Enzyme design. Sequence first.
Site, mmCIF file in Angstrom:
data_model
loop_
_atom_site.group_PDB
_atom_site.id
_atom_site.type_symbol
_atom_site.label_atom_id
_atom_site.label_comp_id
_atom_site.label_asym_id
_atom_site.label_seq_id
_atom_site.Cartn_x
_atom_site.Cartn_y
_atom_site.Cartn_z
ATOM 1 N N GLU A 35 0.765 -1.096 -0.081
ATOM 2 C CA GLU A 35 0.037 -0.110 -0.022
ATOM 3 C C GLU A 35 0.976 1.050 -0.159
ATOM 4 O OE1 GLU A 35 -3.099 0.553 -0.526
ATOM 5 O OE2 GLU A 35 -3.952 -1.460 -0.267
ATOM 6 N N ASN A 46 -7.429 9.761 -5.782
ATOM 7 C CA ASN A 46 -8.111 8.774 -6.508
ATOM 8 C C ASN A 46 -9.126 9.424 -7.572
ATOM 9 O OD1 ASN A 46 -7.347 6.314 -4.953
ATOM 10 N ND2 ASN A 46 -8.535 7.379 -3.253
ATOM 11 N N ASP A 48 -12.422 9.407 -7.845
ATOM 12 C CA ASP A 48 -13.549 9.986 -7.088
ATOM 13 C C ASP A 48 -13.331 11.415 -6.294
ATOM 14 O OD1 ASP A 48 -12.470 9.048 -4.899
ATOM 15 O OD2 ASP A 48 -14.172 7.946 -4.301
ATOM 16 N N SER A 50 -11.083 11.657 -3.805
ATOM 17 C CA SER A 50 -11.075 11.207 -2.311
ATOM 18 C C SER A 50 -9.216 10.842 -2.599
ATOM 19 C CB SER A 50 -11.547 10.076 -1.837
ATOM 20 O OG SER A 50 -11.176 8.867 -2.823
ATOM 21 N N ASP A 52 -5.977 8.691 -0.361
ATOM 22 C CA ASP A 52 -5.618 7.596 0.624
ATOM 23 C C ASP A 52 -4.515 8.196 1.159
ATOM 24 O OD1 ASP A 52 -7.547 5.914 -0.746
ATOM 25 O OD2 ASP A 52 -6.131 5.424 -2.195
ATOM 26 N N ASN A 59 -8.509 5.643 3.117
ATOM 27 C CA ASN A 59 -9.250 6.606 2.334
ATOM 28 C C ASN A 59 -10.098 7.716 2.956
ATOM 29 O OD1 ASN A 59 -12.050 6.778 0.356
ATOM 30 N ND2 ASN A 59 -10.153 6.872 -0.944
HETATM 31 C C1 LIG Z 1 -8.199 1.107 3.524
HETATM 32 C C2 LIG Z 1 -9.472 1.958 2.795
HETATM 33 O O1 LIG Z 1 -9.778 2.918 3.280
HETATM 34 N N1 LIG Z 1 -10.273 1.411 2.184
HETATM 35 C C3 LIG Z 1 -11.298 1.847 1.227
HETATM 36 C C4 LIG Z 1 -12.751 1.100 1.707
HETATM 37 O O2 LIG Z 1 -13.166 1.309 2.834
HETATM 38 C C5 LIG Z 1 -13.756 1.525 0.519
HETATM 39 O O3 LIG Z 1 -14.638 0.484 0.391
HETATM 40 C C6 LIG Z 1 -15.859 0.716 0.985
HETATM 41 O O4 LIG Z 1 -16.068 0.732 2.404
HETATM 42 C C7 LIG Z 1 -17.420 1.181 2.871
HETATM 43 C C8 LIG Z 1 -17.110 1.186 4.494
HETATM 44 O O5 LIG Z 1 -16.487 -0.218 5.032
HETATM 45 C C9 LIG Z 1 -18.152 -0.218 2.830
HETATM 46 O O6 LIG Z 1 -19.468 -0.096 3.224
HETATM 47 C C10 LIG Z 1 -19.693 -0.859 4.139
HETATM 48 O O7 LIG Z 1 -20.018 -2.228 3.437
HETATM 49 C C11 LIG Z 1 -20.172 -3.302 4.455
HETATM 50 C C12 LIG Z 1 -20.535 -4.572 3.679
HETATM 51 O O8 LIG Z 1 -20.725 -4.363 2.298
HETATM 52 C C13 LIG Z 1 -21.464 -2.848 5.526
HETATM 53 O O9 LIG Z 1 -21.464 -3.692 6.501
HETATM 54 C C14 LIG Z 1 -20.984 -1.603 5.930
HETATM 55 O O10 LIG Z 1 -22.268 -1.198 7.032
HETATM 56 C C15 LIG Z 1 -20.786 -0.222 5.021
HETATM 57 N N2 LIG Z 1 -20.242 0.695 5.790
HETATM 58 C C16 LIG Z 1 -20.772 1.837 5.938
HETATM 59 C C17 LIG Z 1 -20.735 2.722 7.339
HETATM 60 O O11 LIG Z 1 -21.570 2.432 5.228
HETATM 61 C C18 LIG Z 1 -18.356 -0.333 1.161
HETATM 62 O O12 LIG Z 1 -18.870 -1.585 0.827
HETATM 63 C C19 LIG Z 1 -17.027 -0.554 0.550
HETATM 64 N N3 LIG Z 1 -17.119 -0.238 -0.901
HETATM 65 C C20 LIG Z 1 -16.702 -1.033 -1.797
HETATM 66 C C21 LIG Z 1 -16.898 -1.176 -3.334
HETATM 67 O O13 LIG Z 1 -15.966 -2.087 -1.507
HETATM 68 C C22 LIG Z 1 -13.257 1.522 -0.964
HETATM 69 C C23 LIG Z 1 -14.379 1.998 -1.603
HETATM 70 O O14 LIG Z 1 -14.680 3.469 -1.631
HETATM 71 O O15 LIG Z 1 -12.144 2.310 -0.985
HETATM 72 C C24 LIG Z 1 -10.945 2.091 -0.254
HETATM 73 O O16 LIG Z 1 -9.854 2.900 -0.328
#
Ligand SMILES: CC(=O)N[C@@H]1[C@@H](O)[C@H](O[C@@H]2O[C@H](CO)[C@@H](O[C@@H]3O[C@H](CO)[C@@H](O)[C@H](O)[C@H]3NC(C)=O)[C@H](O)[C@H]2NC(C)=O)[C@@H](CO)O[C@H]1O
Length: 129
Positions: A35, A46, A48, A50, A52, A59
């Site tokens: 990473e 990124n 979008d 945002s 990292d 993120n």
């Molecule tokens: C290390 C880093 O920052 N990684 C980033 C990822 O966190 C991000 O993925 C998205 O993260 C959100 C938050 O965890 C995910 O939403 C969650 O989804 C789960 C299960 O699907 C659910 O149980 C949670 O309630 C929900 N969180 C809330 C509070 O809304 C979301 O699914 C992720 N998106 C995807 C496409 O995987 C990604 C994408 O923005 O970016 C990374 O940099």
Amino acid sequence: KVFGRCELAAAMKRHGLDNYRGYSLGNWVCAAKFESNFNTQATNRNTDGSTDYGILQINSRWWCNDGRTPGSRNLCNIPCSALLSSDITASVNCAKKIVSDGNGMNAWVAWRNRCKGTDVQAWIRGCRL
Ligand SMILES: CC(=O)N[C@@H]1[C@@H](O)[C@H](O[C@@H]2O[C@H](CO)[C@@H](O[C@@H]3O[C@H](CO)[C@@H](O)[C@H](O)[C@H]3NC(C)=O)[C@H](O)[C@H]2NC(C)=O)[C@@H](CO)O[C@H]1O
């Protein structure tokens, strides 16, 4: 600060990451390596809009506030700059929340693509832990 492999391993272990949520230490060190190449000051923008941040490339759309990511959720309640410190505490505390959010370590794209399913124990070989 650019950590050395075993130096980082020791710090992460000290911070309770070994086997946190079932993920062995090798997973965390492998994730940091790919990473950020172990550099606490790493940042990457990124598409979008945002960014990292740090050693674990956390993120800004979800985890921290950088003041320039419209729609940021700031789930770790910290300014993203805190994640660039030479002291990894903030990054570790936030990472614990991330890995607990439902998708485990799949939240880290480099982990999923380069660590997941590999012999992660090799990342802590030779370290005094
Ligand atoms: C290390 C880093 O920052 N990684 C980033 C990822 O966190 C991000 O993925 C998205 O993260 C959100 C938050 O965890 C995910 O939403 C969650 O989804 C789960 C299960 O699907 C659910 O149980 C949670 O309630 C929900 N969180 C809330 C509070 O809304 C979301 O699914 C992720 N998106 C995807 C496409 O995987 C990604 C994408 O923005 O970016 C990374 O940099």
